[PDB]
RNA sequence: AUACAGUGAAACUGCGAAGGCUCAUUAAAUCAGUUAUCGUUUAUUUGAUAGUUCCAUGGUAUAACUGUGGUAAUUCUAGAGCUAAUACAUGCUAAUCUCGACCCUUUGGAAGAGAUGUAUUUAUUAGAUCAAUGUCUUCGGACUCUUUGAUGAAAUAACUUUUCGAAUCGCAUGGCCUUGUGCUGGCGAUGGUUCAUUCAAAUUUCUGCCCUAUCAACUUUCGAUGGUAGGAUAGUGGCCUACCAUGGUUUCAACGGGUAACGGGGAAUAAGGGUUCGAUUCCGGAGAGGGAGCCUGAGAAACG
């Protein structure tokens, strides 16, 4: 009754914990329950989860959020007060969610894809993300498909990755989902299969869409560290 | 009853320059993108 | 003029009242000797 | 209870002037005080009482927007208003810096002011209080500090009120009385005067003729007193023309060249200004200017210089001339400024101008030979009144081949101020020639030959209507020439004038060439002409655009000759804008409605990439982008690249072979496309038939062989179930061909 | 009403077999509600949360808007002559969205006499009505669904586009 | 061009513009035709994909039915056997469209019982 | 047309072609050792079940390793318990025969059928095959 | 603890049950994925988000409760008397925002003029230019056609029986001397209007394994096919009606024929040898005695 992304061993239950609405959608999150019970396994059981969340060590995004099938989804910077731990998670080659651990000036921000542009009322621009961020007053050239830097103390925009030809692309969707190395090639078709070809060790080559692939820094230069093996 | 009328008026000025003020404080800064761009 | 003026035969209605034999309280005879004019 | 006033107040109109004025005399009674205060002044004021007050002031607002036509006005009513705007004068004016209750009844004056302003809004002629010198002295007697209070962009109660008390007929009695248009002229001409400054002169040149059309002569000395005020105002309207509202200046100098003749240098001041009217702003309208113009003339008619203006008026006249504009209207005020500019240059300007003006007659062609057996000295305004008719005005076509003679034979008698002439004919027919004209192209071409008077025999022989071996022999002369900026961007404006998205005509490509081969040979005087060939392959670019892109693709290419040759000479220039147009020309490869055109383009980048190191790092990236429109499943685009690549090859030298055969094979991978992309070697082999006996690495063109000849390919094609592919005639015995006299 | 599905009919290949389901609530037909003339009676009907909707019946202070100037004032409502959306709804004379009505131009009288001054630029078969009082007037607000009556006036080219049909 | 009743007239001579690659003629921006389901000026907003191909009747007005023959790998029988689609189509005032004629259109907004697709381009 | 998220093409299978024969051969050829049991500790009710088999003890070493790994017991699961326990110790004791599973050469199930031969490097051509071994 | 003070039958309250059996046989129309909704609803999740004030606190009317009773009798009752609210519903409320004539030079703004919302439903329109590294240098400038960029192709005239500008709480005596609660004065949760997201639903683009021409015509016989307008809608929509046109699908398989459609379609888990047994979602839609009509809710034609 699981998804793929989770890495959930078949070995666990019946029940599959449904998340509840949040900043992200069903099927792109994981809830904490899934986090922190039995993947980095700092519990055993729901009844312990709810016990270090009413305690209160998360502090996801900068704020607490104190809940056990909350949806973090892409990049959302799991912090944990004990151990000072911070988590940035994203996807692996093969569909999972990979848990990486990064620093504290790292966790003090995160990015966000811009999905639309409004004059929504009374004179503001406007923009929103994958976690729904709908922060005032960027510059008139956010397109669709760039990247803020939110500031995750407060909630402003600090730096800005345009979306172009060349720039360090992160594909999140369909059959290309969790691929790094955004160059062999540029197609952008009128409806369909129109993106930013990725590479391979051999530089094969990739098809994906617009909004199921996001930028995360340039060629050799995100300022986002990123696992290895 | 009378604190709490103390109270209520003081929360709602302090609302009041907290809010009415940062609106204007943040369109400056679109004013700034708007100067520059 | 497809709906329009269906002249056909329908269900429910076909015996849904039923007739009266005399009917009319006057004559037919009484119907030309009244209105002959 | 304010959305339930309104409604009272849009309710609040049914019953007649009687009712509706026995209600506003009911609130006029609330705390009028007539008793009181309708002597001179109030006895005594409250903060509650002038809140009374404001809201008596709220509620005159109120009834006279509700009836803003008749309003129901009385007397008493006019008594109350006035006592409550002395009130608030008085209490604004006496009470300490608090500013509190102050500000409250500063805007509760400032909205009574308003309310005021509302009664004139509405039943402004209806009744003309005959004692108005009352309020208008009590409103004085406030507002005596008011001086510059009212010039600003919004500034418009006291503004609004001296222009309404400007605007009537005999409202303007309280104006005349002692002063409105002296505190207005203050305002008016302070310095940092804003856009309701020509709100102000309009008002001031519409209250002129009610000052004028009064019998008292106290207005007269007023109106006399407003025509000094467009005299000392003269610098308003001129830092004021920031839009095109000037037919308030052009209908204030216009009455004023009507009403006032008061100073000779007053005249000149116009005159100057109103040719400053069509030298300052180049968006006057037709009626506009020639009002101007017009207005210019009839100072100049009455108080006109002799030397100064003279020369002044001449200008106008020579620029005007050259304008003619509005179906000759603008011609008959030109000439009317040419015979009343009064010199000699304007007499023989009128003479000439009337010789040839005489409403659409044979006069011209008459003139034009009169004044060419009759040169007269004057020259300027006979230049441009010749020059416009050598321009695409059809008649006198020899008469203004005989004009541009003249004004040479003139340029070569002179032997200095008449070749900075000639310098201004040649930038008249440099304009000419970059044109869509017939008639005037040939006078301008005809012009060339007489400032030119080999070279004589090219240019007669360009302008000789045979085209075919005049083309040639173009072609020849420019051989010969090879063998300049603006001169050759003037003949190759010319040839592309005469070869201009002309498609009814042939040897398209020899008039092309002729084009490329005149830039050539003016991209070779590097000193002088390397920005005027720039400029050329630049507007030959943006016609790479602009609608039509055929013969403009091998512009493009051959402009690119420029480049190949500044690059095998160089063996510092700006490489950025190069490299920016070079992906710009890759943004058009992705077009395909523009396939064959961008196939040239690319080998248009291909050819002028020839840098130091860029050409290592751009040109495999370049052989992709040329390449991944040609496996791309085309019958024709990819033969069609094939030819492009074939002249690539040809272009480039051994040393990109390898490039381009990796770049090739790196964009042409996979199955049953690799039995059909070996076309692609297969012509570029034979395509460097002319490269000497070393080679490229050879172990990618013998892979091809191979993988095309040998195994799945064997059998491929040694079966029987394929459908058709013209592309295989087995094609792979040809790159050994290729190598024999290369690698081995 | 009935309902809002394709289930019932059939589509632009002619098929049968229907006999498919019991009808849902989210396939809701009301009662079509023709507004008429009356005293002014607002049903107010409830849809989707609290989205409540205004079904007028009864309406009568229709704001109708001075074209040239776009002056939205209130008046009555007489009769609408034509409207072939239903030849009979005419017979009837009830009161939907883009009929002509025809309007007691009273009001459009006092205001143009209070922002003009004198009494009668504007067009002639116009100013007849200017002159009498019922002046045409469509009907742009939806009184079945927002409960309003709100119109346009009828100022010449308009007019003669209604006065040649009918 | 008013054969029938209630102002027809464009709902706010006007003109507007899809973007994304299509472009408008210009009695479609400045002309006397109402465009009241014309991308071009229209009511509605162009969204989600685009398809093409040849017609076969046009014979009612306001109704382009487009065929769309497109490959299909079979792996059953293995041969190709050709496709063929139907589509119908709002009029635009940019090509009477005749036999023949590939052309293309964008989805948006179901105006009849089956039409979502309104014709942006002729070639 | 379009790509569609497929977990079933980049899930690990590894059990389609997991033949025993083949394993017990690498096993032999592996030169490495094996990590068997001290040697008693592998027989399971004091002889009355079996041994154990490989796959038996592979999946034991499994279990408690998840099982230390996140401190839970398993449990006795009635359906899923019903199903493999009685129907794998029934198999076991047909087919297993002193530790070692004589199943399999009961069994018809082709090897080089999916095992063997190839399918991606299949060389279907001379000059691939040719390539492949130079 | 003489206006409250703990146990607490029976009453109001917040929520609970938050998803269970049988019966007649639907061929991508049941289903699964997918495209889109500037074509639409949305409780909860998440991010954001309010400026109109003339000559010290607002009203009776009902419970529970007592008391008198009826009836064989109910979570059936009726009179009479009181009594409370975050129940009902009338109503108390400082002055700050830009342009800046003037500047006295930094402690710089005093005068004047223009201000000030939401929720509903109506119309006009804001939504072609200037800057250089260069055309000619006459080492000055009219400069855009060239060489590159930029503002750029909700402001207002009205309705509506209009919602609001905190009768919520916690942490912190804290600062001031207007000579007494005179101003309290710092922050955070709950409010509170609106937008977006998330959740879910409805439509909608396309794709997906029986044999079928002895099914060759169907569709206008629940509009057939489309256009225009209205109604109803959560909105798109012949979804329904007026008028008009005679269309539309099909041999490139329309439309129609049945079951090992108690079986099938990936609908899904796969198992280290069982090769169509071997994990599951769904057979189709209904039904709460029988059809019909109505009501409630973010969601329903309700297992209550």
């Given at each position: 009754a699981a998804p793929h992304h989770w890495l959930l061993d078949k070995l666990s239950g019946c029940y599959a914990p449904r998340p509840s609405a949040g900043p992200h959608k069903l099927r792109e999150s994981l809830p904490l329950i899934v986090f922190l019970r039995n993947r980095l396994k700092y519990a055993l059981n729901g009844r312990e989860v709810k016990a270090i969340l009413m305690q209160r060590h998360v502090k996801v995004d900068g704020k607490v959020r104190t809940d056990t099938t909350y949806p973090a989804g892409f990049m959302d910077v799991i912090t944990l007060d004990a151990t000072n731990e911070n988590f940035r998670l994203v996807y692996d080659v093969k569909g999972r969610f990979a848990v990486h651990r990064i620093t504290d000036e790292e966790a003090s921000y995160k990015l966000g894809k811009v999905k639309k542009v409004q004059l929504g009322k009374k004179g503001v621009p406007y923009v929103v993300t994958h976690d729904g961020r709908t922060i005032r007053y960027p510059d008139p050239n956010i397109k669709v498909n760039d990247t803020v830097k939110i500031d995750l103390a407060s909630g402003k925009i600090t730096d800005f990755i345009k979306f172009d030809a060349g720039k360090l692309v992160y594909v999140t969707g369909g059959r290309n989902l969790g691929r790094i190395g955004t160059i062999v090639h540029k197609e952008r078709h009128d409806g369909g299969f129109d993106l930013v070809h990725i590479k391979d060790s051999l530089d094969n080559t990739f098809v994906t869409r617009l909004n199921n692939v996001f930028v995360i820094g340039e060629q050799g230069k995100p300022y986002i560290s990123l696992p290895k093996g | 009853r009378l604190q709490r009328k103390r109270h209520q008026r003081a929360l709602k000025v302090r609302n009041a320059q907290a809010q009415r003020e940062a609106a204007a404080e943040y369109a400056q800064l679109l004013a700034k993108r708007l100067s520059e761009r | 003029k497809g709906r329009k003026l269906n002249y056909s035969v329908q269900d429910p209605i076909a015996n849904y009242e039923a007739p009266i034999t005399s009917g009319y309280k006057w004559s037919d005879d009484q119907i030309d000797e009244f209105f002959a004019g | 209870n304010g959305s339930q006033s309104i409604k009272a107040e849009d309710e609040k109109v049914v019953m007649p002037y009687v009712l509706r004025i026995f209600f506003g005399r009911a609130q006029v009674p609330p705390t009028s005080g007539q008793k009181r205060s309708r002597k001179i002044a109030v006895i005594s004021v409250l903060p509650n009482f002038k809140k009374p007050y404001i809201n008596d002031f709220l509620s005159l607002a109120s009834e006279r927007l509700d009836y803003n036509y008749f309003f129901g006005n009385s007397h008493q009513i006019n008594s109350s208003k006035a006592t409550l705007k002395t009130i608030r004068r008085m209490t604004g004016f006496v009470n300490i810096v608090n500013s509190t209750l102050s500000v409250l009844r500063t805007n509760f004056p400032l909205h009574t002011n308003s309310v005021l302003q509302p009664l004139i809004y509405s039943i402004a002629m209806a009744y003309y209080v005959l004692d108005t010198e009352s309020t208008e002295e009590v409103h004085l007697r406030k507002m005596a500090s008011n001086l510059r209070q009212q010039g600003l962009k919004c500034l418009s109660s006291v503004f609004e009120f001296v222009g309404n008390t400007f605007d009537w007929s005999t409202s303007m009695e309280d104006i005349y009385a002692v002063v409105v248009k002296p505190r207005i002229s203050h305002f008016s001409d302070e310095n940092l005067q804003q856009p309701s400054s020509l709100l102000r002169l309009f008002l001031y040149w519409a209250h002129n003729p009610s000052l004028y059309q009064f019998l008292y002569y106290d207005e007269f000395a007023t109106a006399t007193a407003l025509m000094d005020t467009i005299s000392n105002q003269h610098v308003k309207e001129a830092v004021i023309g920031p839009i095109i509202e000037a037919a308030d200046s052009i209908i204030r100098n216009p009455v004023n060249d009507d009403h006032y003749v008061d100073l000779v240098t007053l005249i000149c001041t116009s005159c100057l200004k109103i040719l400053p009217s069509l030298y300052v702003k180049l968006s006057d309208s037709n009626s506009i200017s020639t009002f101007l113009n017009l207005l210019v003339s009839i100072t100049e008619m009455g108080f006109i210089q002799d030397d100064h203006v003279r020369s002044r008026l001449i200008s106008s006249l020579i620029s005007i001339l050259k304008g003619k504009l509005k179906k000759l209207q603008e011609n008959d005020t030109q000439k009317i400024l040419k015979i009343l500019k009064l010199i000699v240059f304007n007499y023989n300007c009128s003479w000439s101008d009337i010789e040839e003006l005489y409403?659409?007659?044979?006069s011209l062609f008459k003139t034009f030979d009169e004044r060419n057996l009759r040169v007269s000295l004057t020259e300027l305004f006979i230049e441009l009144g010749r020059k416009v008719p050598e321009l695409e005005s059809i008649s006198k076509l020899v008469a203004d081949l005989n004009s541009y003679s003249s004004s040479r034979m003139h340029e070569y008698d002179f032997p200095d101020f008449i070749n900075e002439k000639p310098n201004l004919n040649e930038a008249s027919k440099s304009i000419s020639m970059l044109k869509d004209i017939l008639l005037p192209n040939i006078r301008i071409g005809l012009r060339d030959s007489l400032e030119e008077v080999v070279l004589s025999y090219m240019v007669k022989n360009t302008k000789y209507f045979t085209d075919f071996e005049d083309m040639a022999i173009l072609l020849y002369n420019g051989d010969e020439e090879a063998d300049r900026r603006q001169r050759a961007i003037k003949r190759l404006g010319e040839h592309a004038h005469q070869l201009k998205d002309n498609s009814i005509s042939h040897y398209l490509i020899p008039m092309i060439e002729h084009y490329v081969f005149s830039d050539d040979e003016r991209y070779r005087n590097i000193g002088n002409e390397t920005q005027i060939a720039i400029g050329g392959l630049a507007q030959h670019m943006s016609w790479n655009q602009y609608k039509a892109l055929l013969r403009r693709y091998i512009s493009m290419l051959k402009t690119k000759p420029n480049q190949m040759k500044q690059a095998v000479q160089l063996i510092t220039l700006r490489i950025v804008r190069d490299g920016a147009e070079s992906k710009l020309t890759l943004s058009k490869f992705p077009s395909e409605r523009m396939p064959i055109a961008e196939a040239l383009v690319n080998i248009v980048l291909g050819l002028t990439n020839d840098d130091i190191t860029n050409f290592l790092p751009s040109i495999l990236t370049n052989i992709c982008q040329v390449l991944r429109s040609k496996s791309e499943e085309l019958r024709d685009a990819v033969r069609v690249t094939l030819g492009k690549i074939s002249i690539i090859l040809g272009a480039e030298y051994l040393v990109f072979v390898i490039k381009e055969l990796m770049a090739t094979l790196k964009r042409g991978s996979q199955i049953h496309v690799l039995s059909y992309t070996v076309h692609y070697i297969l012509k570029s082999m034979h395509g460097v038939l002319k490269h000497s006996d070393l080679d490229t690495s050879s172990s990618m063109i013998v892979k091809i062989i191979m993988e095309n000849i040998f195994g799945f390919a064997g059998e491929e094609k040694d079966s029987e179930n394929y459908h058709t592919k013209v592309k295989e005639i087995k094609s792979n015995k040809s790159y050994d061909a290729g190598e024999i006299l290369a690698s081995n | 009403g009935i309902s809002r599905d394709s289930r019932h009919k059939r589509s632009a290949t002619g098929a049968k077999r229907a006999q498919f389901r019991k009808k849902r609530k989210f396939e809701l037909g009301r009662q079509p509600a023709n507004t008429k003339i009356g005293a002014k009676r607002i049903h107010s009907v409830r849809t989707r949360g609290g989205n409540k909707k205004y079904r007028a019946l009864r309406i009568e202070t229709g704001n109708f808007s001075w074209a040239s100037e776009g002056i939205s004032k209130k008046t009555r409502i007489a009769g609408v002559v034509y409207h072939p959306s239903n030849n009979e709804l005419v017979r009837t004379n009830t009161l939907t969205k883009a009929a002509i009505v025809q309007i007691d131009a009273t009001p459009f009288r006092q205001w143009f006499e209070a922002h003009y001054g004198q009494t009668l630029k504007i067009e002639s078969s116009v100013e007849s009505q200017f002159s009498a009082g019922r002046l045409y007037a469509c009907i742009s607000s939806r009184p079945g669904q927002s409960g309003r009556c709100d119109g346009y006036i009828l100022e010449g080219e308009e007019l003669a586009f209604y006065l040649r049909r009918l | 061009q008013s054969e029938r009743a209630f102002q027809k007239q464009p709902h706010i001579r006007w003109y507007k513009n899809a973007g994304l690659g299509f472009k408008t003629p210009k009695t479609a921006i400045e002309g006397s035709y109402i465009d009241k389901k014309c991308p071009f000026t229209g009511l509605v907003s162009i969204r989600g994909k685009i398809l093409t191909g040849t017609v076969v009747s046009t014979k009612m007005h306001r109704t382009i039915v487009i065929r769309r023959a497109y490959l299909h790998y079979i792996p059953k029988y293995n041969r190709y056997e050709k496709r063929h689609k139907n589509v119908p189509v709002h009029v635009s005032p940019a090509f009477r469209v005749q036999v023949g004629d590939i052309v293309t259109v964008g989805q948006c907004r179901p105006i009849s019982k089956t039409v979502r697709f309104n014709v942006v381009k002729v070639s | 047309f379009e790509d569609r998220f497929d977990a079933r093409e980049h899930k690990d299978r590894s059990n389609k072609s997991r033949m025993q024969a083949m394993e017990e051969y690498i096993r032999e050829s592996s030169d490495q050792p094996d990590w068997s049991a001290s040697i008693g500790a592998d027989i399971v009710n004091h002889g009355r079940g079996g041994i154990k088999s490989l796959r038996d003890t592979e999946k034991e070493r499994r279990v408690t390793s998840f099982e230390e790994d996140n401190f839970t017991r398993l449990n006795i699961t009635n359906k899923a318990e019903k199903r493999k326990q009685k129907q794998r110790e029934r198999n076991a004791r047909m087919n297993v025969i002193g530790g070692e599973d004589f199943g399999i050469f009961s069994s018809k199930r082709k090897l080089e059928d999916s095992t063997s031969r190839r399918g991606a490097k299949k060389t279907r051509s001379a000059w691939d095959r040719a390539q492949r071994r130079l």
């Open positions: - | - | - | 409403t659409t007659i044979s | - | - | -």
